[PDB]
């Protein structure tokens, strides 16, 4: 009921100007005009901003074209390349407000007649190089199949939210202080903003919604990774405690040592994210599949007590500001490694019992964690430190095939059983949060509880319940894995 209750998202309703590439077929041209006219209405009915086309009026802002992909590329580059490169009757009554004190994002909608795609994406590669830097910094591409227009709405709401989330408004490059004097605090901010070490294209991320806060200041980074269908690439994804940030990375490991270098690059990527903030962090690392026997050895070296402490001191040397106040230095207070895999031994049937029927119209999730000691009554202790079951009624997305290889029978049952294990649990590096408790059972129930909470960010606004099970970071990583698999 987003439109009925007239709610508004985060990011202040980013405005979008669009260009559409359509073939000169009357059947496909007429459908394009109506589809995007409907898209503008649903985009603006939700408080997502303005979805008007590029301000120049050329037949409803639709650009036409004309084996045939070559014809689809010549006009694609020759036209859109350069393209992106005193009476006031009503104004007499009101005086001008004054000078007082964010360009609209450009989205290029691509219709795909083919029932390869890279042939269509090759425009975007060619256009960006032949563009001025300021225009190129905010330009996005969206590909819609042609079968949507002709053949059979929840698609429009999904497309409107997807376009808004992909905008990623850039950080401003100027402060407009207007010092008009030799030097002052305004100039100090300006000359610090243009320092060479500051990265470019910050591209702040603003989603339609985030998790509500629940009662020092810190943050938790949730990172998960898995290898592709070939071991050439490591795919990783990350998210914040409240889903405020969401980024992904691809690391090339292709040698014809091979994995220790790959894991070092991953740890550098995770360190690059925490060090861009100004508050202490907590790191929880996840693995989509089953953890290896060498990855545990390699991770124990990187996530050692001596190491995590060493980078705290190295940070102090570089930055003066971190030296005075320790509450502002982006150090690491704890580390954790958790692996998720199916069980395939237990089954629960919701039909058997002992107002609402849970599996039909609702999603539920139960957890149970225990210390799982090896016997009753140096760097690495016992293999599973603590274990926990993850019973969820909501369906899980399409996982990689090797995920279900051990117990393929459990793939199809509606209530999924998943197993979460603890492997490292490095507590209180700098020297009460659950992640700093020496009881390994408390750590899992905190990590699994946040795994459930992050799974609710997957609720499609066009759908009643969450589209897929598990954390949001796991879900995007899985989407990236299949995208690489399909097109390559």
């Amino acid at each position: 009921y987003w439109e009925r209750l007239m709610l508004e998202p985060y990011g202040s309703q980013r405005d979008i100007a669009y260009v559409v590439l359509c073939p000169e077929n009357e059947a496909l041209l007429n459908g394009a005009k109506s589809f995007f006219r409907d898209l503008t209405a649903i985009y603006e009915s939700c408080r997502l901003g303005q979805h008007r086309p590029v301000s120049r009026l050329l037949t409803d802002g639709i650009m036409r074209v004309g084996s045939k992909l070559k014809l689809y590329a010549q006009v694609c580059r020759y036209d859109l390349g350069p393209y992106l490169a005193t009476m006031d009757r009503d104004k007499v009554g009101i005086p001008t407000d004054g000078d007082s004190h964010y360009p609209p994002a450009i989205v290029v909608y691509i219709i795909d007649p083919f029932t390869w795609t890279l042939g269509l994406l090759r425009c975007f590669l060619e256009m960006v190089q032949t563009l001025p830097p300021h225009i190129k910094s905010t330009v996005s591409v969206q590909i819609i199949p042609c079968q949507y227009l002709l053949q059979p709405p929840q698609h429009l709401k999904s497309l409107a939210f997807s376009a808004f989330t992909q905008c990623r408004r850039p950080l401003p490059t100027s402060t407009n202080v207007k010092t008009l004097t030799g030097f002052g605090p305004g100039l100090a901010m300006e000359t610090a903003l243009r320092s060479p070490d500051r990265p470019e294209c910050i591209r702040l991320y603003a989603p339609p919604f985030i998790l509500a806060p629940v009662k020092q200041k810190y943050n938790v980074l949730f990172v998960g990774y898995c290898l592709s269908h070939d071991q050439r690439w490591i795919l990783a994804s990350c998210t914040d405690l409240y889903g405020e940030l969401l980024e992904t990375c691809i690391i090339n490991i292709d040698v014809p040592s091979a994995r220790k270098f790959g894991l070092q690059k991953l740890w550098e990527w995770c360190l690059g994210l925490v060090q861009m903030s100004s508050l202490p962090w907590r790191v929880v690392i996840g693995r989509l599949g089953r953890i290896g026997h060498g990855e545990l050895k390699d991770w124990s070296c990187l996530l050692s007590r001596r190491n995590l402490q060493s980078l705290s001191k190295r940070l102090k040397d570089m930055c003066r500001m971190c030296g005075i106040s320790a509450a502002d230095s982006p150090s690491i207070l704890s580390a954790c490694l958790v692996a998720m895999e199916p069980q395939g031994s237990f089954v629960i049937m919701p039909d058997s019992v002992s107002q609402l029927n849970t599996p039909q119209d609702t999603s539920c999730t139960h957890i149970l964690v225990f210390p799982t000691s090896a016997s009753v009554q140096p760097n690495i202790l016992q293999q599973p430190l603590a274990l926990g079951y993850f019973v969820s009624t909501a369906k899980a997305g399409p996982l990689p095939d090797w995920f279900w290889s051990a117990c393929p029978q459990a793939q199809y049952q509606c209530p999924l059983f998943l197993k979460a294990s603890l492997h490292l649990h490095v507590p209180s590096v700098q020297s009460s949060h659950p992640l700093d408790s020496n009881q390994t059972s408390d750590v899992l129930r905190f990590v699994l509880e946040q795994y459930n909470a992050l799974s609710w960010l997957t609720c499609d606004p066009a759908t009643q319940d969450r589209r897929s099970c598990l954390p949001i970071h796991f879900v995007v990583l899985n989407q990236l894995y299949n995208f690489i698999m399909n097109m390559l």
Binding site: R4, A192, S195, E244, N252, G272, Q275, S277
Partner: protein, 67 residues
């Protein structure tokens, strides 16, 4: 904590956006709470970073290179 209790049926003819409030829908069904605006957490951290000058991150192409 925050569980689910009941389900309500409403005819699709009562759901229109002309009226400013929600006539068939009640805000108490969803446990709505109005909280005042604040600056985004991500935006603020960018501002506080200007006083730090940490190491420059990799160009995002350093990862996709032969080992």
């Amino acid at each position: 904590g925050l569980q689910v209790s009941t389900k309500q049926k409403i005819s699709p003819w009562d759901l229109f956006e002309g009226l400013k409030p929600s006539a068939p829908l009640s805000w108490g069904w969803f446990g709505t709470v109005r909280v005042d605006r604040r600056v985004a957490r991500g935006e603020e951290q960018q501002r506080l970073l200007l006083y730090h000058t940490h190491l420059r991150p990799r160009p995002r192409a350093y990862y996709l290179e032969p080992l």
